[PDB]
Symmetry: C3
Amino acid sequence: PLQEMLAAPSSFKKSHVLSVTQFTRADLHLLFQIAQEMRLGVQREGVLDILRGKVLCTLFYEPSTRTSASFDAAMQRLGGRTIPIQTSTGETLQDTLRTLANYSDAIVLRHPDEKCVDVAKKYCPVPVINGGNGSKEHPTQAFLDLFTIREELGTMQGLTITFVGDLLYGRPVHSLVYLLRHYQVKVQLVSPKALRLPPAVRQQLVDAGQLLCESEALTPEILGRTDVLYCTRVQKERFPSLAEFEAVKDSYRIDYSTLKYAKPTTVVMHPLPRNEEVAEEVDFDQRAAYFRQMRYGLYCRMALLALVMS
Amino acid sequence: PLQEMLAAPSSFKKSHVLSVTQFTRADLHLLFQIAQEMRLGVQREGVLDILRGKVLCTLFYEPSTRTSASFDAAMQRLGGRTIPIQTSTGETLQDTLRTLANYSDAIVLRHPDEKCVDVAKKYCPVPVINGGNGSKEHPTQAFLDLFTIREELGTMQGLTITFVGDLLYGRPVHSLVYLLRHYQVKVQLVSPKALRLPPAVRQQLVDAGQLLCESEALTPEILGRTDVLYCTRVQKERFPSLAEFEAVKDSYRIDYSTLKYAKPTTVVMHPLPRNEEVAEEVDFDQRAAYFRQMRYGLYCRMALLALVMS
Amino acid sequence: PLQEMLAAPSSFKKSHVLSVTQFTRADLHLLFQIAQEMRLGVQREGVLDILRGKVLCTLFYEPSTRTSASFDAAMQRLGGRTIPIQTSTGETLQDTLRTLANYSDAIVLRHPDEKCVDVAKKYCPVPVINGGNGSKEHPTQAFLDLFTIREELGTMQGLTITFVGDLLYGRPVHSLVYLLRHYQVKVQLVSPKALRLPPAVRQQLVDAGQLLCESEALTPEILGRTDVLYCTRVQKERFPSLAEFEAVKDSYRIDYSTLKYAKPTTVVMHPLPRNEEVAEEVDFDQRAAYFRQMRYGLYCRMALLALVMS
C-alpha cells in the first residue's frame, strides 16, 4: 500500500528538489498521500525499511536545527543512514558538493547564497534537496505548511488564510501563495505598507481570484473570518524608526486578547523561529499548531526522501 | 533474562530522569542488574536489539564529549538511532525542546541554566534525561559512580569513602552522598575549610551515621583506611590567593608518594575532567579506576535508556 | 569471496594504522583486492553487513570534511555505527582517547600535533587510524592515491609520474614515493628550487632507480611524457616575495593550455583542497580524476576498516 504508492510515477524520483515551481498539484497530492502512510508506519514500528542501503548527507552552512534534525530523523526513520555536516563559507561549494556526492546518495543543502541551487544543478551528480538558499526558497517548508492546513482543517475549499507581519521578506508566504494557486481560498494580508507582498506575488493572488483584503491593522473583523492565521517574524531591522517597529509588534502580537476575536477553529501557524509575535501564553491552546507543523514536516520529508531515493 | 528484567516495573519507564531524588534503592538495584546484563550482551554481539525503532536526540548547549558520546554510544549499542545536536544559548530552550520532541522519543539535555529541568518538565512532551543542569545535578554520573564502587569492591557494607578536594562546588559528591544514604559506609572529607560540604549535605551524613572524619589534610592515616578515594577538581578561581591554591594542590595530588600510604585495594575515582590532582604516573596503576568509570557509565546508560524507552 | 578475503591474514587486523612504513607490498595488494570487492557490494546493496555490531568514533581536532565524512560513510556502509566528534586543542588528548576507547571499537584521529600518533600508541587501548598528524602523514590518503593510479591506468610498470608544485611541504607526495618504492616507474619533479623534495626523499627515488627529471618549469616535454600529473597546493606563505609566488602559480596552473601538451590518457590528481592550481574549466575533462579519487578513497577505507575491525 506504501510500497504501492512508492511504485507510482513522480517528478520527485531521482530529482533535485530546489523550487516549488517544479511540482504540480498531483505531485503534492501524491506526496501528501505517502506522508499519511509514513505517519502510520512510524506510529507502529518507529524505524521503517524503505531506505536501508541509502545514505543521506546534510550540508548546512548556517545552522537550522529544526530543518537539519528534521531531515536527519526522517532519513533514519526510513531506515537509511545519515552523515550530518556542519561548515561555514577556504573550499568552494561546488568542490564540497562533488566531494560529498561520492559518499552519499543525496544531499540536503542549506547555504547563504541563493545561487547555491544553480551551483548544485551545474556540478553535483546526486539529487540535492534545497534546505534554504539565501532565504529565497525553502520548498519542503512550503510543502509541510500546505500539508499542515489540509491536515488540521480538511478541505481547502472555503478557507480564508490571513498572512500577518512582514510579507515582503517573508518568503515562506510567497512559496505558499504559489502552492495555493490550485485552491479556492481567500487571502487576507496584514502588514505595514512598507512590507506588503512583492507586486508580482500580490498579482499572483488577484490572478487566481483570491485576494480578499489588504490591511495595515489586525482587526477583529479580519480575525473573525480567519480559518488560518499564518504569522511571520517581524525583525527590528525592517524598520528605520524603533517606535514604528514596536507599534507594529504590539498590533500584530497573537495573544489571548487577539485570539478571542478569532474562530474556535482558527489554526495559528508560524514557520519559526519566533520572537514575541506569538505569546507563550498561547502555546497550549488547541489552535496553536506551530509545533504540530514540525511533526507534519517529519512525515512530509520522509515521503519526499522515499520518493527522491526510490 | 534481559527481556525479563526489562519486563519488570520501574520508576524509569516513560519518566524524566532529572534528579537522584526521584529514585529508590530498588530503582537503582534493578538498573545495576540490567547494566550487568547490558555488559554481557555487548561483550558477545556489540550492537543489541532492545531499541530498534527508537530515536534519541542529544541536545548539548555546552560540550561534554564524555557524556554526549557516552549516550550516543549507549543508544546505538541498544540498536536505536541517535540525532546529536550541538548549540549554544536566539531561540528559547522550550521552543527547541518542543521542536525536537517531534523527531525523537527522548532527549538528553545539558544546559548551563539549572532551571532547565523545570523548563523541560513544563514543556517537553517526551522523556528528558538530565545530562547536567548548570552543574547542580548530573544523575547518571551519580549512578555510574555508585555502580563503579559496587563493581570494583563488591558489597558496600564496611567501606570507607574519602572525598578529596573541592567539596562545596563538587556536586557529584553531593549526589553520591544522597545515593549512599542506604548503605553502612563511613565517609571522610578532605578539603580546605573554605570548601567543606554545604551544611545540609554534611547533615545528611551525620543523620545516616556515616561522618567519620573531616580534615584539611590528606594524611597517611586517612589514606590508610580509604577503600575509595574520590577526587574532585580544585580550580584556581575557588581561592583568592594563588599561594593557598597551590598549597592545596600539592597537598591533595594523588601521585605515587600518596598512593604508597593507601591500601592495595583502594579504588581511585574522579568524575573528570582532571587538572593535575591525579598524576599521569598513576594512570596505569590497577587502582586507577577513572577510565573504567566510563565503561561502567556506558553499561548504566544503556540500562537507563532501555528502561526509560521500554 | 569477500568473507574469504577478510578471512585472510593481514598486518591490518587489530592494528593501529599510523604510518605507510607499517605495511608491505602484499598488505596493500590485499587491501586493494578487498576495496574492489567493497565497490561491488556497495554497487548492489548500498549498506553491507561486514561490521554490524562495531562502533567507530571519529575524533577530529581540525575539520577535514573530505576525510571525516569519508570514514563516516565507510563505516556506515559496512553496516557499523559511527560517533563523530568535533573538538579543538582543557582536556588532554590521552584522556580523550582513553575516554572514547570505552565507547567504540576504534578511533580515527586527526590532530595538529605530529606526536599524536605516539600518544595514541602509548595510551589508547583500541586501534587508532591516523587521519592526519600535524600534516606529517596521512596514510589512507597515500593508499587511496596509489589505488587511484592503479585503477585509472592498469599496471604500474612503464608509468611516468610527475609531481608538481610544493614538494617540500607536500607530504602526500613523500608518502606516495614511499608506496611507489615497489614499482618500475619514473618520476619527474617540478617545483621551485626553494621547494624541492627533502634530500632523503629524493634519495629514496634515486635509490629505487626512478628519478627521471627535476625541473623548475612545467614544460611541454615534461607534460608529453606524463602518465600521472599529481598536483599539490602552493600556498603564498611558502614564498617571501609575492611576485615569485604568482610567477609560480601561473607557471604550474593546470588549465586547457596546459593539458593540450599532455597525453590523452594523463590522469590529473590532487589531494585537495585546491586553490587555483587546477582550473575549474578542467573539472569535466575525462582526465580530471580528483573527484574520482574520493570515491576510490571510500572503497579503500571500507576495506581498511573491515580489515582492522575484522
